[PDB]
């Protein structure tokens, strides 16, 4: 199957001072957002009609309540212990947790935390593992948290029992959108000159879904190894954008073409031809 193969929740908790902290949270299938968190209500926002997967409305409400209590309690506890952990304001904590489906069918769960944009801890085999970047503070944190009976058990259940069934259920529930095929469009432009007597040619590919794509500059059937793939950029409404560039000498641009291959094109590649002297 094509499309996303993992589910995760994220948290960003920004501590301005000892009496002001705010948290942002959301739920994702790879980099596609399927849940939002509404801080006005302390409840989730279901972004797709299938965002609850195969879970009952009762189980979903139970999970929303766990996250609401967690978000409030997290800020409460961090503010209470910040002095003991020698925290300097402002500071920002990030967290990600979820699970992924691998080749062979195994589902692997993960949980990572960060402080100041650096790794702070991870969960390995239902244990708190301090990250070296986290120093003695992360060691102190893990030793303190594992003594919370309720928290250790809730985390274990959510990562290893709730997440794998939720993932399978939502990959199935959302397959109309997750495994849809959206055709790219492609066009050529003449980019920023890399130097004297040199040109940059740009092949743009936009609006495709899923993300895997193949773009290359060609001279006939010869793939130009000089092709530079840009990083994949997002469009709104679950599609992607990509630039493929080629730096050439002024008199070497004639004869070039850009070829695009995508899963949605049913083996019918897009071929664009670069023409010189402002003939596009």
């Amino acid at each position: 199957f094509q499309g996303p193969t993992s589910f995760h929740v994220i948290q960003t908790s920004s501590f301005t001072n000892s009496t002001w902290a705010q948290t942002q949270g959301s739920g994702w299938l790879d980099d596609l957002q399927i849940h939002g968190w509404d801080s006005d209500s302390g409840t989730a926002i279901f972004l797709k009609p299938w965002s609850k997967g195969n879970f009952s409305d009762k189980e979903v409400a139970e999970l929303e309540e766990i996250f609401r209590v967690y978000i409030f309690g997290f800020a409460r506890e961090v503010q209470d212990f910040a002095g003991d952990f020698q925290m300097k304001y402002p500071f920002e904590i990030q967290g990600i947790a979820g699970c992924e489906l691998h080749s062979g069918g195994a589902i692997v769960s993960f949980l990572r935390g960060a402080l100041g944009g650096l790794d702070f801890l991870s969960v390995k085999n239902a244990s708190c593992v301090p990250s070296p970047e986290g120093g003695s503070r992360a060691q102190k944190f893990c030793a303190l948290i594992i003594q919370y009976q309720g928290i250790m058990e809730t985390v274990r259940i959510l990562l290893y029992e709730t997440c794998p069934r939720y993932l399978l259920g939502v990959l199935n529930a959302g397959k109309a959108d997750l495994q849809r095929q959206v055709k790219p469009e492609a066009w050529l432009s003449s980019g920023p000159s890399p130097g004297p007597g040199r040109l940059q040619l740009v092949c743009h590919v936009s609006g495709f879904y899923p993300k895997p794509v193949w773009v290359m500059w060609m001279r006939g059937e010869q793939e130009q190894q000089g092709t530079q793939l840009g990083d994949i950029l997002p469009n709104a409404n679950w599609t992607w954008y990509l630039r493929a560039t080629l730096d050439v000498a002024d008199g070497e641009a004639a004869g070039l073409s850009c070829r695009v291959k995508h899963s949605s094109l049913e083996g019918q590649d897009i071929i664009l031809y670069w023409r010189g002297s402002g003939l596009n």
Partner: protein, 100 residues
Amino acid sequence: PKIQRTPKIQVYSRHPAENGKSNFLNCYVSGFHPSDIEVDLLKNGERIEKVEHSDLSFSKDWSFYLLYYTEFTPTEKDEYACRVNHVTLSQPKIVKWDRD
């Protein structure tokens, strides 16, 4: 918890620019830390009021990223840009849209 990272700013159109044809202007802001950021889309130096944006996300290296976008009708003379302010910047950073 001390190193801050300045935002990368990439401006692009959803569709090839055709003068007088409705399109979408995108501004992808990434690689920044901490998360607080102000992003505006500009038309001839003036802020566009109706701009949409993604909820906060971050990459595996913990750097934040956001997509800002708006409907736009490009012409020959009109200029478009993305203006960003962040704690790592002393002044707002402006990246102009360039179809070429």
